[PDB]
Design a protein around this nucleic acid. Structure first.
Length: 49
RNA sequence: ACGAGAACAUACGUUCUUUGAACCAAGCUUCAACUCC
C-alpha cells in the first residue's frame, strides 16, 4: 500500500505523472548532492514563497 | 531678265510568329499545466 513499495519487486518500475507530485519530482540535480540538495531546496522554495 | 522655270523621296507594309515563372522543399524542432502555501 504505502509502507515502502521499493524493495519488494524492482520489476514493474515507477514513473511519476504530474498530479501534484511535488518539487522534488520535477527538479533533478541529484549527483552527488545529499544534504546540499535538501538545504538548497529548502532555501529556494521557502525564502521566495 | 540667275543652267534656268515648274516637281512632296513619295506610294503599299501589324515588331509579328512559337513559348506554363516553372522545378525540388512536413510550419517544423526541443516543451508534464505545473509549482508553492
Amino acid at each position: 500500500t504505502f509502507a515502502l513499495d521499493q524493495p519488494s519487486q524492482n520489476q514493474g518500475e515507477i514513473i511519476y505523472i504530474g498530479g501534484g507530485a511535488g518539487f522534488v519530482s520535477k527538479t533533478l540535480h541529484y549527483k552527488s548532492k545529499n544534504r546540499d540538495q535538501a538545504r538548497n531546496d529548502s532555501f529556494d522554495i521557502l525564502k521566495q514563497l
